[PDB]
DNA sequence: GTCGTTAGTTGTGGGACTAAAGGATATCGTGAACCGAAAAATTAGTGTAACGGGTATCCCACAACGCTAG
């Protein structure tokens, strides 16, 4: 049986992750560059989108809510490096 | 008829490009709210004066003779 990627995300099953991540790396990166202009810290923030949504995978509802879930938060991210005073 | 071999491309990738002086730049995008950390300021509490001998030092002044008789 060929479950929809959501399902495999919820079920507890890591290749799902590896299924989100090559289908929405590119639109993660071009999100992270249209926020902050620093590719290295564009890449760590994607890193931590796509873990943090696995840790939050108990939490989606919706094949779609995925996808808006790693924008959301990936902006977010660059958002707060605005506030760093480190950055 | 079919498979490995050799040479000559062909596309693609990595590496060079005087010497002297000088040598200034400008650098977006914003989400909230609470907790913890340490660095700083404000506040509360206790106090001497002369005396006895005896002796160490200081400043300050003066002395350190000359003659006659038993």
Same mark, same amino acid.
């Given at each position: 049986?060929? &479950?929809s990627?959501?399902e ?12 989100i991540?090559?289908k &929405?790396? *590119?639109?993660?990166?071009?999100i992270g560059?249209?926020?902050?202009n620093?590719?290295f810290?564009? #890449? ?7 873990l943090?949504?696995w ?6 509802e919706?094949? #779609?809510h995925?996808? &808006?879930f790693? *924008?959301?938060?990936?902006?977010? #991210?660059?958002?707060?490096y &605005?506030?760093?005073?480190k950055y």
């Amino acid at each position: 049986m060929l &479950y929809s990627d959501f399902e495999l995300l919820k079920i507890g099953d890591t290749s799902a992750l590896d299924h989100i991540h090559a289908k &929405y790396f *590119r639109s993660i990166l071009w999100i992270g560059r249209q926020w902050l202009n620093d590719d290295f810290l564009i #890449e760590s923030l994607v890193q931590d989108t796509f873990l943090k949504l696995w840790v939050n995978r108990d939490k989606l509802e919706s094949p #779609e809510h995925i996808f &808006y879930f790693l *924008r959301f938060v990936m902006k977010r #991210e660059c958002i707060s490096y &605005y506030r760093k005073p480190k950055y």
